[PDB]
Structure formats: structure tokens, C-alpha cells
Design a protein around this ligand. Structure first.
Ligand SMILES: [Mg+2]
Ligand SMILES: [Mg+2]
Ligand SMILES: [Mg+2]
Ligand SMILES: [Mg+2]
Ligand SMILES: [Mg+2]
Ligand code: NA
Ligand code: NA
Ligand code: NA
Ligand code: NA
Ligand code: NA
Ligand code: NA
Lengths: 1011, 409
């Protein structure tokens, strides 16, 4: 049978799901979480052969290795080895929608392994195989004999091989189907891959064994007392002499213990579970677990005879914490959480969907170092070690069933169909059975983007019955359905409603108070971090802090899903959708991360870090008020560093230990300060530093900062007179001005500064001209495609209005000689097909000091779409090593994404002034700049700028960063005004009105001089 | 004047525009719009281009779509504006026939002027003296005092047009909301007026930093810079250019800097006492009634013309009053000011208004006081006992620019 085309068959001969087992035969090894000789890894070198369909696999393969097979590492995704292409499709299914069928051409991966089994494992007990992740369905044979079948790419499939193995050499044969009926429930927005991509292991358990165990922790009103209850079930030989002992340890100290024979309480007219027992341990003043202080105990579950023989022991880390929603709030240990979350897919640019310890650790450290305290398993159960790590390092986790049917029409077509209830049930039930004892999991989710079907209602209820300790959430069907304890919208905006029919996305503040609504609201996805984005992030955090029931959200998402490809020369480059021949595909939509695929941060990460700070500050005179947002810890590893600088020049600084209780406040009065007579703005910067290293950070890590303008002394100082007056020389074509070793040339036909000489060296490669456009950001383009234009997208509106192709028409160009200067005045109009879009009027005043003051006044037609920027640009002849500026930094920052930036004097290598987004766009801007130095030039004013070796035109025309080529000289874009970048979503215009350039008239001024 | 703002915000019909399409939504819960008709009018800079009427027939909570006819192109630069009004044709127990119950405006196409003026018939002359820079053009003369740095006199023929020089102004006669409960006997230092007093805003004096004159090919250019200081602190710096051309227009550019640590000022504008008094005030901007940045929704952009006294609001407790915002052109006597500003014009100085507690004791001063603002602070009112002006209506930008053209009519 084609079991893979039948949602009624999701496995054959598969064992029951359960929490992590290791079958230790020594309790102290279980207590220590040391390795168990009864749990072996079969990871390593396997044999593999690719077939275009299951019908192409030859029968001999069951009995022996195929000579044409290759040896490959397992776990792996076979696309990563090049056998076939990975596919990047977002919502549309990668296969024709015709449930429950799949393509007859269905890539089949034939894996095999010859391995050893010691006779002792076969003398007694049971030997099972466990495949933690096989995508998407597979048949298993052992020594040529058929064992079983499994579906659900994201949970372990276990089979008993006791009767199939023999001492010594044994051979497995695993026929993995890329497509199966399971694929209809696996439509998440990620690369479509396949293979044995999680661990493979062999577990020996005794015949009489622990088959499942559940640990719960309940508390008294103030959490000073708890009862740990552990229900343990056994399989096998039930006899009066059996007992279960559960002991709880805090380090090497045993804090509690209980022993009991099997036989639970009477449950009904037929009696009780004679194969189960519940132990209850009282624990006084338990050390509570939270993401802030991940206190853990170790519970050891010993199955043994009453007279003392340990049969086997299992164990887990226990976190004493209670999760509950009360009065509309999600509370953890009685206090309301504020979720600083992020969605994280399991993605590696070289290994595909294969996860490894190092990578997970690296992600958890960076998450924590960036003030995240929570992660959502978008959109499936994760590799088992993830949970261990979030339990130990401390992150709150939303564990999510592997159910996504986004591409159906309507989206709940399968989820409302009872015939798909069984397949969906398994995805929910087996997840809970496996991950229910992990303290890090605080909320269960029913899956993602599958509409709202009666199957969801049924399953919501199942979990609520089986595990009352955690809320259940689910966004489908409008995010506030009867299948969710939490209003958990994706991309609902802070103030702006989006009233789509049936599944509107209300402003999050308005959503909480709709008639009859009382649940807490935590966005399952917000702040779509695709390319240059995170514009508006601060607006979310301000609302979250202000409204109790607004408890946070999970950013979409942590890491770009880019894959490495190699060029002719063998140099790696970041690839996205369609780069593997895959089509249809969704191009760069797979890259939405705060960090690049190699974990390098994108600039948005620092904005998230800042807004997600755990300390808030207020300044009043010289008193700094620090407020802690921690709920359970005191600031026992923190000091406050403060510094005052006058326009970047350090004046005074100090440090003060921070001692604030959770939710407490501390006042810190600063020293009498410098009141310098010298002009400039005084700026106070404070930073919270952690003096001691932690499990997740190095000594000196900075966890928070904030700045305030202090006193400002405006300059009233007159510049001395210049022993010199610039001279003007005219011709029909140009106005030339000379002053000392300097020269300026203004073209009378174009109306622009066409060249400048310092000494006798030319300084420009292209003239200085106004610029009203930008190489569009992913958020400017949204879903627009050549093939299917989205006229509402910003890029399309600019295109259709002619912004990118408008030509400057000269309206006026004059030159006048003043007392001590030459003044050039110009006016230009930009038109498109008869429409005047913008008018630029300027004056350039060159004085005897050699400075050139430029004043620009622009008019923008009120009926043209608001332009991306209002600025000047030019290609400088010079290429210099560094860029030094007095303004916001040091990282890239945009109008709606600049809270993290601090005003100071910064100095970086040129290359740092470019952000290598995989899909190129306008990037590297720095705002609020008062002075910029590059080579011999200095520009002063109040502007935003970018500077790099790549023109806006080049960036707009190139689809991949590795294809960009440094141009001659350096392109400088200096903006009086720049539009926000948006990001509430990446498929509809999202730039907030206050960040759109709609004033109609704009004024800016700069002084360009040397040094 | 606040009543009209209330009337507008409390309208029972909401409107949206999409193309030629106007969508009217009824906020009535029970009645149909059985005594209402929609009147629409399109004007270019105040000049009527077209209009019409359509009967309204909307059920409670329902919507009605109205298609406007093809809008003939306009022959001239300018901004087209669409205004709609809901008029009740029949009298009711509480209103007369013709009662307007709701209105809304939208900007439609705008055609920016790219038409080069025309070569001045003459060239103004600059006369420089130890104490002044004078400019003469035809029968007009402008005088800039070199020690003060301000335009101190302007003549049409032998007629002086100013009583006081044209000077920057950063303060306003305090509103009730600016005062709050502060009292001479019990100052509320948190009130706006007290912050401004304490910072020296009302006492700061202009110190000249620069005053130069240059002649250009067709114009004379005066450049000035002043600092306003208090107890040795620089509160504001105003830099300007006055460019007088062959046409007789005086183009004034103003760039101001406001120290970041001083309380945000009540306004950033210029003021002067005009020598003459005129019967009417005519402007192209928002009106017709008094309107402020945070209280201007009800006002409409059009060409308005009122008697000068309608330009003063007789609040019992006098204060800054009578401003109109969003003004592109203002006409008074033979004078015309063009730009994008807010203004008030009356027989009372801000000084008098702030020194007078009851309207009945104010007395018309000689000439007319004109306050013309590039920017003006919101008036607030969420309450009148604590600062209530929203951040977005505070003049906190630090650097401000505005430009005006003063010419004769
Ligand atoms: Mg099946
Ligand atoms: Mg023992
Ligand atoms: Mg034996
Ligand atoms: Mg999806
Ligand atoms: Mg496509
Ligand atoms: Na909150
Ligand atoms: Na995506
Ligand atoms: Na501390
Ligand atoms: Na591009
Ligand atoms: Na009617
Ligand atoms: Na008064």
C-alpha cells in the first residue's frame, strides 16, 4: 500500500511517545545526567542512495548494500549533499494540492547502516531504535525484515527491534519519502527539505520498565511551599515486590524522597491503574525556576524491587514554577510576565535543518545577551536538546505542534475535517507526551496558519484535560478563537487597525478591550525583520510597558534562512529562494532574521536589545531613577556607568553600584557637573554593566543604556574675518570660483556643482545632485513582482509616479559676487510626463574662509506619493579608510529605528558603513548627524547620511550581495530627510504616518569645508 | 471659537475619499438621512472651479457612495481642494432650513508653479550709512537699523508703515491653560507660563551678532543674526535674510535655533505694530474662525474675508487669541504677506493682553499689531490645571525654518 497517501495511516508498529529516556542501571549516573551505557548513538557514517520514486528502489537493497550507494553523514538533509534541490516556497504548497495524494515523482532517500549489537542486549530486555527526525515519512527494515512506518517529521519514531536483531552485525534499511500525506500538515514558511535529519539511537530497556512519567509542581499562595507529584507508569512484569522511589536533589543534596508500591487510587467502577503509582514529595521554600534565575532540581525515578534491586532509573531536571492566567494576565510564579520573545526556526546555512549543540548554544547565548527571555518553536517540536538548554540557561518556551496547512483554501479546509483529526491528534498528543516535564515549556501551541477548525477545538480541550499546568494558544482563524487561552495575533499593529473580513487584525490596544474580551495578548509574531527593517519597534515596547494585558510578543524571526552556495571560484555566497532551480519559489522571503545565517547580527538586533532592556530610567535634575523590570531577581550583578560629554568630548564619568529589588526603583544623584563655557550640547549616557561573568555572558557585558541631552550652549561666536575673497570667472557654460588652493565649478546648463579641486586634485566623479529616491528596501517592495505588480507597495507607487525616472529641468542658475563671497543660486524642477513632482531651490555661498554653505528648500507635490528621501548625492573621487562622525551610532540607524543609537563621536572603517543585507537595498544610514569627516572633507549640519562604494542604482539593480562590485571612489548620500523603513509586516505598506515625508516643504542646510 | 471644533468632531456623518469617490457613512443608530443633502465644491486656491449637490440617502450605520464627475483640468498652478457639506434642506424643531450639519475637506491635485517670474522693471538701490541700510525702489523705502539689526521703518511714498520695528517673538500672552492654577501669591512652577518666565523668555533681549548688506544683480540682500539671552544663557538665535527685488517684494527667510534645555517656546514668529488700521482682513488659509495647531480641524482652507474685529476673540480673561493657521496669503490694507504661516492681527499688543485681566479694560492701541508665526505651540485643554499640550504640539525641534514674502498690494 501507498501508506504515504493515507492520512489514516500515520505509523505502523510505532511505540508510544514518552519523555526522554536513557535507562540508566545506576542511580547516581542518572542523578548526574551522565551518559548511559543503555542509550547508544547510531549517528555517523551511513550508506545512501537517491531514487526519483519509491517504485524505483530495487528489492535487493533490503538484503544488501547498493554498490552505487555513497557513504554520507547522518543526520543530514539530502538536499544539503546535493542529491536534489531544496525548495523555498512560503504559503503555496510545494506539491499540487490534491489531498491526500502526492506526486508520483517523489524523491526517495534509501539509507542504510550496518552496525553492531552486543549479545548482552539481546540476552534480556528490549532493544529499540529511535529516529528523532525523518522528513517526511519512512519505512523501516531490520536485517531484511519489515519493521514499521512513521510520519511527522518533527517528533521521534521508536520501534522495538528485539526480535529482529542478532548478536554482532546487523543492517538497517530506511526508505525515506520526501512527500507524503504528512506534507499537507507541513506547509511552514521555510526550505522544503527531506532525510534523517535528527539523531538516530538505540535504547535498551528492561522487560519491566518505566514506560512514562509526569512531573508536576503545585504551590501554596506565596510559593513558600510546594508539592512535587510524579506519576509513574510501568510496562512489563507487575508484581507486589515492585516499588518506585522518586528522589529530588538540589545539587548533591537530597531534599526529598518518596517510595511506594504500584497501584494508583480507584478511578472508576472497574478500579484503578495497577500499573501506575503517584509519589508526592513535599518541598519547603523551593528555589523557583524562571528565565531570570533558572533554578533546577534533579528528580530521579527509580524502578526497583522493595528489597533493593534497582531495575532501571530515568530522571529529569525539574523547575519549580507555576504558570497560570488569572484576571486576564499570564503569571509566572504569581507575577505577570513581559515576553521579550523571538520565533526561531532550526536552520543552518551549511547543514540545512540539522541542529547541533554548538549552534543551539550560540543562539541561546546571543538571545540572552540581547535581552530576549522567550522563544517560540516556529512551527514544530524542536530537536530534544533545545529544551534541555532552555531549561538550563533559562528561556520561556512556546512548544508548538507540527501542524501548518497554510496553502489550503480556505486555510481550515483540513483542520475542520474530521478525517484529518487523527493525523492532527498525533502531532499534538505526541508532542505533549514528550515535552511535558520540561520547565522551560510554559505554553503549548496547536500549530500555525491552519485556519480555525473543529479539530483545533477538540485538541485544545485534550491538552487542557491532560495538562492543566500550561495555557494553550493558537493564532489561526483570527487569533482570539475558542481554541486559544491567549490573544496571539501575528503582525497586528500597535495603534492601527487592519479590519480584514473574518480575521481582522485589530490594533493590539483596541483588541484587549473589545466587548466581552478579557484574555492577555501576546503576539505570536511581530516586527517582521526582513532586510532593513524593525522600523517602529519601539512603538510596540512602549505599549507593552504601558498596558498590563499587553504582555509582549515574539519577533519574526531569529535567523535568516539563507543557504550557502559556491561560485565557480569556489567562494561561498548566501542563496535564497529560487537559487537552486526551485520554482515556483518565494525568493528572499526566507530571510527575515535578526541575525544572518552565520549568526552575525543584523543592525536591527541592537534595536531589539535596547527596547527589551530590563531597567528603565528617568532623569530629574541630576537624579537618575532606575526602575527594575525583573520580577524575581535583585540587580546583584550590575553597576551603573555614567558619562557626560560635550559634543563627543568626554567631560566627566563615574560608576555606581546598582542595588534595585525586582520591580524596585533606585535613585542616583549625580555629581555637580561641568558647565563649560565652550559651545555645544552636553550629553549624559548611562550603561548598566555586569561585572561578573555568567553562564550566558562575559564579564563587563552591557545590558542596558540610555542617553539624555543635558545643558546646551548655543554658539554665538563670530568667525574671524578672512584675509581673502573668492574670485568668480564666468563663461556661457560655467561658473568657476577660486579661493586659494581651492576651486569650485558649477555647470550652467545642468545647474549643479560639477567639480571641486583641493589643491589641484579633482574631488568629484559625479556632480552633486538632489536625490528623492532610495534603492528599495524589502519593506518598500513587499510582495510586488515583475510578473505580478502590487500597485499599493511603496516601490510601485514611486515607480508609477516617475520618481525613479524624473529628470531635473533647470529653472534658474545665477552667480553673484558679494562683499566677501560668491553666491550661486539655483532652482530645478523634476517632472514626469508633464507633472512637476519636486522643486529644489538652493544657494551656495562660498566665502573667504573657503567654506561652502549650501541651503536647500524643496517643494514636493502633495499629490505625488511621499518620497523616500530629500537629500543630495555625489560620487567622491576619494576612497578613505575611515569615516568619523558626530551623530547617532555607531550602527546603521533609520528614523523609525534609531532608539538604540547613541549620539557621540564615532569612527569606523569604511566597510562598516555598509550593511551587507543578502538582498541589497538602501542601507548604512546614520541619522542625527551634525558633522561628518571623510578624507579631506568635512560636512556640518543636521542630516542623515550613508557612504559606501556602491551607488543607489547599483544596489537597486543587484539581487544578491555577492554580486555587488565596489565602484570607483565613494558614493555619499546626505539627506536632509529620510523616510522610515517600516517592518510591522513585509507585505503591505507599514511606515507609520509620522515617518512619511508628507510636509510638502522641506528645508535643510549644510556647510562643506576642508581640513 | 471652540464650539465649532466640537460641532465638527461630533458630526454624525463620516467621509472617505477614493478617487472621484466619496463614501459617506452614517453614524445615526435609528434614523435614515431623510433631511440631508451633500453639497460639494472644488476650488483652486480659493477660486471655485466646480460644485454640485447630491441627495443623501443613507440608512443608520449604512454607507452611500457618491461619484464626483470628471474634474476638468485647471488652468494654473495651485492646490485644488475639495470641500463637502451636509445641509438639511428642511427646517426642524431645532434648526432652520439650510442648517449645515457636517463638513470635510481633502486636498486634490496640486500643480506646483515652475513659471519663472519676469525680469524686474527696476533695480532697488542700497544706501548705506553709519547707522542704517536703506533700500529704495520706486516710491517705496525700507530701513534697516545697523545697531538693532531689524527693519525699523518702511514707507510707501512719504507714508511710514510701521509703529514698532519688525522683530522676532518667542512668547505669547498666556492662555488660561498656560497659567493653570499658578498665582502670583502661589506660583505653580510646573505651569507653562512659570517655566517660560523662569527661563527668561519674557525678559530676553535681542543681542546683535551680525548685520550686513549686499547688492546682487537684481536685488539687495540684508543678512542679520541675533541672540536672545538670559542670565548669560543663549535661549534662541535667529538668522535671517531679507532679499528686496525689482518687483518690490521683500523675501524674508528665518532660521531659528532654540537651546535644547530651555522650555519649548510658545511660538517662533515675527511681530510688528503697523501704522495703519484697515477695515478688513482677507486671507487664504484655514478659517474662518480662530484656530490653533491642536484645534484646527473644524476650520476650512479657503479665501476668507472678515472685519478686523472678528479677528480678535473676546475671551473674558484676555490672552493670545485670534490665530488662524495654515495661511498661505494674508492681505491687510495695501500689504500682502505670502508663505505658510499662522497669524493673528488686532488692535491689542500681546503685552497689553498679558497685562490685562478683564476684556473690558483693554483699549485699542494705535495702528494694528501683527503677529506672524512660522510655528505656534498647541493650546491644550485636557485640563486647565496641569500642562496639557501634547508632545506633538510642543516646539521642540530645536531648529526651525520659515519664509515669508511681504509685498504691496
Ligand atoms: Mg499516511
Ligand atoms: Mg537509594
Ligand atoms: Mg544473562
Ligand atoms: Mg505559513
Ligand atoms: Mg514566486
Ligand atoms: Na504589559
Ligand atoms: Na518568511
Ligand atoms: Na548590583
Ligand atoms: Na536590490
Ligand atoms: Na436625504
Ligand atoms: Na491676560
Amino acid at each position: 500500500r501507498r501508506d504515504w497517501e493515507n492520512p489514516g495511516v500515520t505509523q505502523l508498529n510505532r511505540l508510544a511517545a514518552h519523555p526522554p529516556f536513557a535507562s540508566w542501571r545506576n542511580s547516581e549516573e542518572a542523578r548526574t545526567d551522565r551518559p548511559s551505557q543503555q542509550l547508544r548513538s547510531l549517528n555517523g557514517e551511513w550508506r545512501f542512495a537517491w531514487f526519483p520514486a519509491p517504485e524505483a528502489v530495487p528489492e535487493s537493497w533490503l538484503e544488501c548494500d547498493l554498490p552505487e550507494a555513497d557513504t554520507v553523514v547522518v543526520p543530514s538533509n539530502w538536499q544539503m549533499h546535493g542529491y536534489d534541490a531544496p525548495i523555498y516556497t512560503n504559503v503555496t504548497y510545494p506539491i499540487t494540492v490534491n489531498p491526500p495524494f502526492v506526486p508520483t515523482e517523489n524523491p526517495t532517500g534509501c539509507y542504510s547502516l550496518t552496525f553492531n549489537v552486543d549479545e548482552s542486549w539481546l540476552q534480556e530486555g528490549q532493544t529499540r531504535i529511535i529516529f528523532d527526525g525523518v522528513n517526511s515519512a519512512f519505512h523501516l527494515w531490520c536485517n531484511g525484515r519489515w519493521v514499521g512506518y512513521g510520519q511527522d517529521s518533527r517528533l521521534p519514531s521508536e520501534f522495538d527491534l528485539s526480535a529482529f536483531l542478532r548478536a554482532g552485525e546487523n543492517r538497517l534499511a530506511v526508505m525515506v519519502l520526501r512527500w507524503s500525506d504528512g506534507s499537507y500538515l507541513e506547509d511552514q514558511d521555510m526550505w522544503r527539505m527531506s532525510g534523517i535529519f535528527r539523531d538516530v539511537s538505540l535504547l535498551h530497556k528492561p522487560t519491566t520498565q518505566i514506560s512514562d512519567f509526569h512531573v508536576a509542581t503545585r504551590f501554596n499562595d506565596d510559593f513558600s511551599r510546594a508539592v512535587l507529584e510524579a506519576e509513574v507508569q510501568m510496562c512489563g512484569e507487575l508484581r507486589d515486590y515492585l516499588r518506585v522511589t522518586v528522589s529530588l536533589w538540589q545539587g548533591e543534596t537530597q531534599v526529598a524522597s518518596g517510595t511506594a508500591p504500584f497501584g494508583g487510587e480507584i478511578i472508576d467502577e472497574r478500579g484503578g491503574y495497577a500499573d501506575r503509582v503517584t509519589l508526592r514529595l513535599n518541598v519547603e521554600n523551593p528555589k523557583l525556576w524562571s528565565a531570570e534565575i533558572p533554578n533546577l532540581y534533579r528528580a530521579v525515578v527509580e524502578l526497583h524491587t522493595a528489597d533493593g534491586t534497582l531495575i532501571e532509573a530515568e530522571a529529569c531536571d525539574v523547575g519549580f514554577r507555576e504558570v497560570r492566567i488569572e484576571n486576564g494576565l499570564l503569571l509566572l510564579n504569581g507575577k505577570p510576565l513581559l515576553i521579550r520573545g523571538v520565533n526561531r526556526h532550526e536552520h543552518h546555512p551549511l547543514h540545512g535543518q540539522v541542529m547541533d549543540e554548538q549552534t543551539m548554544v550560540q543562539d541561546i547565548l546571543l538571545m540572552k545577551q540581547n535581552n530576549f527571555n522567550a522563544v517560540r518553536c516556529s512551527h514544530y517540536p524542536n530537536h530534544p536538546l533545545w529544551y534541555t538548554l532552555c531549561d538550563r540557561y533559562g528561556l520561556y518556551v512556546v512548544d508548538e505542534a507540527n501542524i501548518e496547512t497554510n496553502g489550503m483554501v480556505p486555510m481550515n479546509r483540513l483542520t475542520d475535517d474530521p478525517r484529518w483529526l487523527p493525523a492532527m491528534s498525533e502531532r499534538v498528543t505526541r508532542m505533549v507526551q514528550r515535552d511535558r516535564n520540561h520547565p522551560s515549556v510554559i505554553i503549548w501551541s496547536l500549530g500555525n496558519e491552519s485556519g480555525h477548525g473543529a479539530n483545533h477545538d477538540a485538541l485544545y480541550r485534550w491538552i487542557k484535560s491532560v495538562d492543566p499546568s500550561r495555557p494553550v494558544q493558537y493564532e489561526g482563524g483570527g487569533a482570539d478563537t475558542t481554541a486559544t487561552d491567549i490573544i496571539c495575533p501575528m503582525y497586528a499593529r500597535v495603534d492601527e487597525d487592519q479590519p480584514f473580513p473574518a480575521v481582522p487584525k485589530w490594533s493590539i490596544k483596541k483588541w484587549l478591550s473589545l466587548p466581552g474580551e478579557t484574555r492577555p495578548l501576546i503576539l505570536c509574531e511581530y516586527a517582521h525583520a526582513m532586510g532593513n527593517s524593525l522600523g517602529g519597534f519601539a512603538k510596540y515596547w512602549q505599549a507593552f510597558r504601558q498596558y498590563p494585558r499587553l504582555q509582549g510578543g515574539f519577533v519574526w524571526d531569529w535567523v535568516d534562512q539563507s543557504l550557502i552556495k559556491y561560485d565557480e571560484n569556489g567562494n561561498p555566497w548566501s542563496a535564497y529562494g529560487g537559487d537552486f532551480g526551485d520554482t515556483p519559489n518565494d525568493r528572499q522571503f526566507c530571510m527575515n532574521g535578526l541575525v544572518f545565517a552565520d549568526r552575525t547580527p543584523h543592525p536591527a538586533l541592537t534595536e531589539a536589545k535596547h527596547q527589551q532592556q530590563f531597567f528603565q530610567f528617568r532623569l530629574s535634575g541630576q537624579t537618575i531613577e532606575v526602575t527594575s523590570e525583573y520580577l524575581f531577581r535583585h540587580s546583584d550583578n550590575e553597576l551603573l556607568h555614567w558619562m557626560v560629554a560635550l559634543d563627543g568630548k568626554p567631560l566627566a564619568s563615574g560608576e555606581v553600584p546598582l542595588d534595585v529589588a525586582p520591580q524596585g526603583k533606585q535613585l542616583i544623584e549625580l555629581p555637580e557637573l561641568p558647565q563649560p563655557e565652550s559651545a555645544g550640547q552636553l550629553w549624559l549616557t548611562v550603561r548598566v554593566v555586569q561585572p561578573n561573568a555568567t553562564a550566558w555572558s562575559e564579564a563587563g557585558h552591557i545590558s542596558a543604556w540610555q542617553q539624555w541631552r543635558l545643558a546646551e550652549n548655543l554658539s554665538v561666536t563670530l568667525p574671524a574675518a578672512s584675509h581673502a575673497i573668492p574670485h568668480l570667472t564666468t563663461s556661457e557654460m560655467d561658473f568657476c570660483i577660486e579661493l586659494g588652493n581651492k576651486r569650485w565649478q558649477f555647470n550652467r546648463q545642468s545647474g549643479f556643482l560639477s567639480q571641486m579641486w583641493i589643491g589641484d586634485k579633482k574631488q568629484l566623479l559625479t556632480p552633486l545632485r538632489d536625490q528623492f529616491t532610495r534603492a528599495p528596501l524589502d519593506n518598500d517592495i513587499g510582495v510586488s513582482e515583475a510578473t505580478r505588480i502590487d500597485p499599493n507597495a511603496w516601490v510601485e507607487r514611486w515607480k508609477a509616479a516617475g520618481h525613479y525616472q524624473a529628470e531635473a529641468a533647470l529653472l534658474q542658475c545665477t552667480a553673484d559676487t558679494l562683499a566677501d563671497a560668491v553666491l550661486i543660486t539655483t532652482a530645478h524642477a523634476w517632472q514626469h510626463q508633464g507633472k512637476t513632482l519636486f522643486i529644489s531651490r538652493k544657494t551656495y555661498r562660498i566665502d573667504g574662509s573657503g567654506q561652502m554653505a549650501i541651503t536647500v528648500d524643496v517643494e514636493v507635490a502633495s499629490d505625488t506619493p511621499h518620497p523616500a528621501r530629500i537629500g543630495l548625492n555625489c560620487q567622491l573621487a576619494q576612497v578613505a579608510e575611515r569615516v568619523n562622525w558626530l551623530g547617532l551610532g555607531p550602527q546603521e540607524n533609520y528614523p523609525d529605528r534609531l532608539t538604540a543609537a547613541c549620539f557621540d563621536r564615532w569612527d569606523l572603517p569604511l566597510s562598516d558603513m555598509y550593511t551587507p543585507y543578502v538582498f541589497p537595498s538602501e542601507n548604512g544610514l546614520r541619522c542625527g548627524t551634525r558633522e561628518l569627516n571623510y578624507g579631506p572633507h568635512q560636512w556640518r549640519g543636521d542630516f542623515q547620511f550613508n557612504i559606501s562604494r556602491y551607488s543607489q542604482q547599483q544596489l537597486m539593480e543587484t539581487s544578491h550581495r555577492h554580486l555587488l562590485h565596489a565602484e570607483e571612489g565613494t558614493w555619499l548620500n546626505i539627506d536632509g530627510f529620510h523616510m522610515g523603513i517600516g517592518g510591522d509586516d513585509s507585505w503591505s505598506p507599514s511606515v507609520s504616518a509620522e515617518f512619511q515625508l508628507s510636509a510638502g516643504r522641506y528645508h535643510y542646510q549644510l556647510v562643506w569645508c576642508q581640513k
